[PDB]
Specification:
Chain A: It is found in: Cell membrane, Sarcolemma; Cell projection, Dendritic spine. The structure is a homodimer. Chain A is an alpha+beta fold. Chain A contains ten helices and 15 strands. Chain A has helices at 42-59, 68-82, 89-101, 126-141, 190-198, 281-288, 298-304, 316-334, 342-359, 367-370; strands spanning 4-6, 13-15, 32-33, 164-165, 175-177, 183-185, 213-216, 223-225, 234-236, 251-253, 257-258, 261-265, 268-270, 275-276, 395-397. In chain A, the strands form six sheets. Chain A has a three-stranded antiparallel β-sheet, with helices on one face. The complex binds protoporphyrin IX containing FE (2 copies), ligand XFJ (2 copies), 5,6,7,8-tetrahydrobiopterin (H4B) (2 copies) and zinc ion. The site of one protoporphyrin IX containing FE has 19 residues of chain B, from loops. One protoporphyrin IX containing FE (HEM) is lined by residues 102, 105, 107-110, 113, 117, 150, 152, 277, 279-280, 282, 285, 342, 347, 371, 397 of chain B.
Chain lengths: 402, 404
């Protein structure tokens, strides 16, 4: 019934009672488990809405109370006649905060408290959209002292199409299908960089060409928006001892800002709702820089480091992975830019567990994404049992708009 | 699309559908509401169908399926059970049965080698001295002077009321963990309880950091004898780092043979309460879990000191560097001792082959991602980008209670 979740490094044993709050079901069944997998009426909305409203006022003192009284009524009315309602600004600030907290893949959750919710539900043109982006980005970068934030664009309509950001991050490097099967720059970004060309933009042949923004208002042809260079803040990557590293001319950006997700709240749905925290050095070091399907620079730096590619058993792959990571870490502390090493980050998540285990008795987590891509067993999380289940409001993946 | 689960490989873009799981006549702990994939652990009428099952499988391996040899051996197992509530496997199907459970084990990257497991029936066994000798033979054979061969030895099954056979020791080789009375431990803290249980039995403990535990062996009911192992028979490997000189000075060593001994092999309903299996090590096992887990031997702290590293802060990345070096140290010393070993990249590359095989053969391979993917260099290995499906199949290894 209620699950025993033990930490193995410390013999400590808890129970998750928070699961029962999950409405939405996942992939696992009694027969076989699919934890590893990356992805997947009228009156019914009134119930999601409802259950979100109880959540809300229990959040503030006013639980099951006296404005919780008639507020549950404005909704009664507004779906009753028009089959969809709108959120009060305070209520939306709650939904964002909550939905991050609710996301079992996010190791940066200790922070869910502090978050800046820009409101754009008054956005009509894609022009206005752009402005909001630059402003989200300005507030969020904060000259290098990064601040977690989420601009929220209009909630999709029963009738019409959607506001959608086509980009899968506000900042990104172009990916350029050369002529020889070859790829120049970020390969995870080819199919997309093609769409900007297709919607008529001047490309480069740069490794770290920052891409422009393709924003789309409902039932309208996507518009392109070249992003004022000054907002995108990037870091050259050097190395505390290897003199030769910055020869390589590797750079990364500061702001990780997801844009292709779907903010689901109180039953309503936000197709654009970009959000941006701050990076964990391994995202930049290990995946971003080393994934084969990406920039894939492991071998390069390994040869530099005069190591031995010839065989796997010389650990050359692990040896480089650690410098590159170590390089990524340095760089930010050099350039006065917020960064979080895996160790430091997982330690605090550990905290967040307990911390929530208190507040709400449990907390959903996707172990495989919670544990770092290098040196896993060397973080605590690796030794902590986790329980993963779906909790509204939360972020949800959505099919690309083309 | 198919009525089965889609399995993508995010590095190569490839897909396959796992249809083996259709045959999981056993339940796991994940349910549509919540997933418990991370949790380390979560006979009258039935005993028939379980064998009914296993036999079908047998007669498939031989591809003499549906035939009269089939139905005759089917009409024989009932004969026997129907009359006595139990049956015995022919020796040929024990050999099959054993390999199938290994092949089935969702947590073993080793499985590329599944068909090369070499089985010693010891179902004739009856005392405990007997147990110890059979076991020696095993080690003897399987160590094979460092050029190591996978092997299992099977001891007589469970019964209606009649003491199980049981090996108390978890592996056939695990170093003593002596609790100092200053709070700490000396040696492997994994094995405290067992080291305790051995002095409590008349072994006189040593006082080093790497003393090989004596072997605790139970026969049916007769409360368990305590046997020691011939020092020449337990191939140890002392550890040096190839470039860094002072490592050998750390006094670290490891044993060659990883011999799981406390598990249960289950086939056709029948339960084999003591039936240990050995393979060979994968660098990380030793060089990350064993030597570095804070719960364990925990050397990371000292090694970084020796590496002149800044341990005051984590942004220095000392854990990772020290770990990499310790592993490089594990691989070098086995390599140089001419003692079978396998690096993590090389272990996974090969799991990925096994998956491509098992797809052709059974249509699916069950796996614990959290357990398949190595404890360092996670993503650096192909498996990491491999969606997997976990599920229970029989024959199977089960975890079992500590006997006390
Ligand atoms: C502030 C410090 C933060 C840290 C250290 C952090 C770190 C991370 C990391 C490392 C991941 C895994 C990414 C991956 O495996 O590729 C992640 C996932 C995620 N985080 Fe954060 N993040 C932070 C801020 C935020 C914020 C502010 C939000 C919400 C607005 C957020 C929401 C998410 C979501 C929704 C995912 C999973 C998304 C997906 O699977 O696409 N994170 N976080
Ligand atoms: C060929 C050399 C082998 C290698 C390199 C290898 C590797 C591994 C590894 C790394 C684990 C996970 C250990 C952990 O993380 O705690 C494992 C688990 C396991 N292995 Fe192997 N293995 C090998 C041979 C075998 C053999 C010969 C058997 C039995 C015939 C076997 C059966 C199992 C089983 C049943 C488990 C899971 C049981 C449990 O949950 O503890 N493996 N193997
Ligand atoms: C293309 C794609 C497909 C897919 N199925 N999932 C994803 C999400 C995984 C993913 C990939 N790149 C980047 C991220 C960013 C995660 C992230 C988000 C925030 C807010 C902060 C931070 N440090 N990190 C996440 C991306
Ligand atoms: C509570 C618990 C449950 C469980 N299923 N396994 C364990 C033990 C985990 C464990 C620890 N050290 C060692 C092993 C066996 C590793 C192992 C076994 C074999 C046969 C080959 C090889 N290379 N490696 C397993 C504990
Ligand atoms: C196949 C596997 O589920 C997939 O590659 C996951 C594994 N672990 C991960 N871990 C983190 N931290 N981030 C990820 O994107 C992933 N991806
Ligand atoms: C909490 C976590 O599941 C636990 O530490 C698991 C994680 N992955 C593992 N993976 C392997 N191969 N072996 C283990 O013992 C563990 N331990
Ligand atoms: Zn599951």
């Amino acid at each position: 019934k209620f699950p025993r979740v033990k930490n193995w490094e410390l013999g400590s044993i808890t129970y998750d009672t928070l699961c029962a709050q999950s409405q939405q079901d996942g992939p696992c069944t009694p027969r076989r488990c699919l934890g590893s997998l990356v992805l997947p009426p009228a009156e019914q909305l009134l119930s999601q809405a409802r259950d979100f409203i109880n959540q809300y006022y229990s959040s503030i003192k006013r639980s099951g109370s006296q404005a919780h009284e008639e507020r549950l009524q404005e909704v009664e009315a507004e779906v009753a006649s028009t089959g969809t309602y709108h959120l009060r600004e305070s209520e939306l600030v709650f939904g964002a905060k909550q939905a991050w907290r609710n996301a079992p893949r996010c190791v940066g959750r200790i922070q869910w408290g502090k978050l800046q919710v820009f409101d754009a539900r008054d956005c009509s043109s894609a022009q206005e959209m752009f402005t909001y982006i630059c402003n989200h980005i300005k507030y969020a970068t904060n000259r290098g002292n990064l601040r977690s934030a989420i601009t929220v664009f209009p909630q999709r309509a029963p009738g019409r199409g959607d506001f959608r950001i086509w980009n899968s991050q506000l900042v990104r490097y172009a990916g350029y299908r050369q002529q020889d099967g070859s790829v120049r720059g970020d390969p995870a970004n080819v199919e997309i960089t093609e769409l900007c060309i297709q919607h008529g933009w001047t490309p480069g042949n740069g490794r770290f060409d920052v891409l422009p923004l393709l924003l789309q208002a409902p039932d309208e042809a996507p518009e392109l928006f070249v992003l004022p260079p000054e907002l995108v803040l990037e870091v050259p990557l050097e190395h505390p001892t290897l003199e030769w590293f910055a020869a390589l001319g590797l750079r990364w950006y500061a702001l990780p800002a997801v844009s292709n997700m779907l903010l689901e709240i109180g039953g309503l749905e936000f197709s654009a709702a970009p959000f941006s925290g701050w990076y964990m050095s391994t995202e930049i070091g290990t995946r971003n820089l080393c994934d084969p399907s990406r920039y894939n620079i492991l071998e390069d730096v390994a040869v530099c480091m005069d190591l031995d590619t010839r065989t796997t058993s010389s650990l050359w792959k692990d040896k480089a992975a650690v410098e590159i990571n170590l390089a990524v870490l340095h760089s930010f502390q050099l350039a006065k830019v917020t960064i979080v090493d895996h160790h430091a980050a997982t330690v605090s998540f550990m905290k967040h567990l307990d911390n929530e285990q208190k507040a709400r008795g449990g907390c959903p987590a996707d172990w495989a994404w919670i544990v770092p891509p290098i040196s896993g067993s060397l973080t605590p999380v690796f030794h902590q049992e986790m329980v993963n289940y779906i909790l509204s409001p939360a972020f949800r993946y959505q099919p690309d708009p083309w």
